Write an enzyme that holds these catalytic residues in place. Structure first.
Site, short mmCIF file in Angstrom:
data_model
loop_
_atom_site.label_atom_id
_atom_site.label_comp_id
_atom_site.label_asym_id
_atom_site.label_seq_id
_atom_site.Cartn_x
_atom_site.Cartn_y
_atom_site.Cartn_z
N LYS A 21 41.53 -42.98 -11.59
CA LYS A 21 40.15 -43.08 -11.02
C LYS A 21 40.53 -43.38 -9.61
O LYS A 21 41.11 -44.13 -9.36
CB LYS A 21 39.50 -44.04 -11.57
CG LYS A 21 37.81 -44.10 -10.84
CD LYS A 21 36.94 -42.69 -11.40
CE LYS A 21 35.73 -42.54 -10.54
NZ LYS A 21 35.73 -41.70 -9.15
N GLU B 119 25.68 -49.55 -6.72
CA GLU B 119 25.64 -48.43 -5.89
C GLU B 119 24.33 -48.33 -5.12
O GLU B 119 23.32 -48.23 -5.72
CB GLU B 119 26.07 -47.08 -6.62
CG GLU B 119 27.33 -47.27 -7.64
CD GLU B 119 28.47 -47.06 -6.50
OE1 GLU B 119 28.37 -46.94 -5.29
OE2 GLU B 119 29.77 -46.59 -7.16
N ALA C 19 36.26 -44.09 -2.56
CA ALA C 19 36.24 -43.73 -1.11
C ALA C 19 34.94 -44.70 -0.61
O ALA C 19 33.75 -44.40 -1.29
CB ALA C 19 36.34 -42.47 -0.57
N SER D 133 32.68 -39.29 -10.50
CA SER D 133 31.99 -40.46 -9.49
C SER D 133 30.54 -40.43 -9.27
O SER D 133 30.07 -40.83 -8.15
CB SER D 133 32.87 -40.43 -8.15
OG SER D 133 34.02 -40.64 -8.17
N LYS E 225 34.41 -48.04 -11.84
CA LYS E 225 33.58 -47.47 -12.96
C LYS E 225 34.63 -47.20 -14.21
O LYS E 225 34.11 -47.16 -15.29
CB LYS E 225 33.45 -46.10 -12.48
CG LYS E 225 32.00 -45.91 -11.56
CD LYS E 225 31.89 -44.77 -10.67
CE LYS E 225 30.89 -45.17 -9.64
NZ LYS E 225 30.82 -43.92 -8.62
N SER F 152 34.71 -46.68 -6.31
CA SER F 152 34.16 -46.15 -7.54
C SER F 152 35.48 -46.35 -8.45
O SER F 152 35.33 -45.94 -9.70
CB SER F 152 34.32 -44.44 -7.12
OG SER F 152 32.90 -44.12 -6.79
CL1 CBT Z 1 44.51 -43.53 -2.73
C1 CBT Z 1 43.53 -42.35 -2.86
C2 CBT Z 1 42.13 -42.63 -2.62
C3 CBT Z 1 41.25 -41.46 -2.62
C4 CBT Z 1 42.01 -40.03 -3.52
C5 CBT Z 1 41.00 -38.88 -3.53
N1 CBT Z 1 39.66 -39.00 -2.78
C6 CBT Z 1 39.99 -38.00 -1.53
C7 CBT Z 1 40.12 -36.50 -1.62
C8 CBT Z 1 39.38 -36.07 -2.75
C9 CBT Z 1 39.40 -34.51 -2.90
C10 CBT Z 1 40.15 -33.67 -1.92
CL2 CBT Z 1 39.99 -32.15 -2.19
C11 CBT Z 1 40.66 -34.33 -0.90
C12 CBT Z 1 40.65 -35.90 -0.81
C13 CBT Z 1 38.64 -39.67 -3.03
N2 CBT Z 1 37.64 -39.49 -2.26
N3 CBT Z 1 36.43 -40.07 -3.07
N4 CBT Z 1 36.93 -40.53 -4.04
N5 CBT Z 1 38.46 -40.25 -4.26
C14 CBT Z 1 43.24 -40.30 -3.80
C15 CBT Z 1 44.09 -41.27 -3.43
#
Ligand code: CBT
Ligand code: CBT
Length: 263
Positions: free
Chosen positions: A209, A141, A212, A105, A48, A45
């Site tokens: 941004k 996606e 995952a 996202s 984006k 993501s």
């Molecule tokens: Cl390196 C990095 C990767 C992902 C994150 C944030 N998260 C994980 C995340 C999000 C919210 C909570 Cl509450 C806990 C973990 C994410 N998931 N999907 N998109 N991003 C932060 C830093």
């Protein structure tokens, strides 16, 4: 600071996975610290922001309007479309779609926007044309998050993404007004931004941004700094970990702690 690369290497140990990491001085672009900077990782993501940059470039070129309303159907909806699923009968404007893509996202939103610009091939061309010869989007996606080991589809490197973000936010590629919108969407991220904001000292600037994927793949791009103004770009990607999301989060937190400590 090399102490932060200790944390990055701790993360590779504890996660059992590859981590790529880079810090870039936002003013000059100089690389301040790096770990696997030219290795590829899935963008997920994080793509984006690049997408909406390409959307903004069209707006600046008068090929798009942020207020133009986009209609779609129940069969357009893919996994994880929290805002777009609410507007089947309304449609959404281009601006609302970029807000949904970056701040929430929203996957369907990103697809709809990918359509407006010509799809992954055109995003890739847009990047190439602003001097990013490495980053590539190939799929839509949700397939673009597949993260097959060694697959180059839909990947960037920490170095390519960091330099691209800097140019998006501070070069003359986009108008002032378009940079400011793109940076506004990123400061309003609802996914990782609240976590970063709570952890960092008050008054710090954060625009980011995150993403995952499959296979423990995750990442984030960010512009941050003290006193309400960003001074650095940080990019972190990881793939291949079988660690729980808790372990994965704790490692990200340790890396961020060192970043700030040695600012
Ligand atoms: Cl390196 C990095 C990767 C992902 C994150 C944030 N998260 C994980 C995340 C999000 C919210 C909570 Cl509450 C806990 C973990 C994410 N998931 N999907 N998109 N991003 C932060 C830093
Ligand atoms: Cl998943 C995830 C989301 C947000 C964070 C934010 N941070 C700090 C942070 C700051 C900058 C970067 Cl680059 C990464 C993490 C944090 N520290 N303690 N608890 N959360 C960490 C992991």
């Amino acid at each position: 600071h090399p102490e932060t690369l200790v944390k990055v290497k701790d993360a590779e140990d504890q996660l059992g996975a590859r981590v790529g990491y880079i810090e870039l001085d936002l003013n000059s672009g100089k690389i301040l610290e790096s770990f696997r900077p030219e290795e590829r990782f899935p963008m997920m993501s994080t793509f984006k922001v690049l997408l909406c940059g390409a959307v903004l470039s069209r707006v600046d070129a008068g090929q798009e309007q942020l207020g133009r309303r986009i209609h779609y159907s129940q069969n357009d909806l893919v996994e994880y479309s929290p805002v777009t699923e609410k507007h089947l009968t309304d449609g959404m404007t281009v601006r609302e779609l970029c807000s949904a893509a970056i701040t929430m996202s929203d996957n369907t939103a990103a697809n709809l926007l990918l359509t407006t610009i010509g799809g992954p091939k055109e995003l890739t061309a847009f990047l190439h044309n602003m001097g990013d010869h490495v980053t590539r989007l190939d799929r839509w996606e949700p397939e673009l998050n597949e993260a097959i080991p060694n697959d180059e589809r839909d990947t960037t490197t920490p170095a390519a993404m960091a330099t691209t973000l800097r140019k998006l936010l501070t070069g003359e590629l986009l108008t002032l007004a378009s940079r400011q919108q793109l940076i506004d969407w990123m400061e309003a991220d609802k996914v990782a931004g609240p976590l970063l904001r709570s952890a960092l000292p008050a008054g710090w600037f954060i625009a980011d941004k995150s993403g995952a994927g499959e296979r423990g793949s995750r990442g984030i791009i960010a512009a941050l700094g003290p006193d309400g103004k960003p001074s650095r770009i940080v990019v972190i990607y990881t793939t291949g970990s079988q660690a729980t999301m808790d372990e994965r989060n704790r490692q990200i937190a340790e890396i961020g702690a060192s970043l700030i400590k040695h600012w």
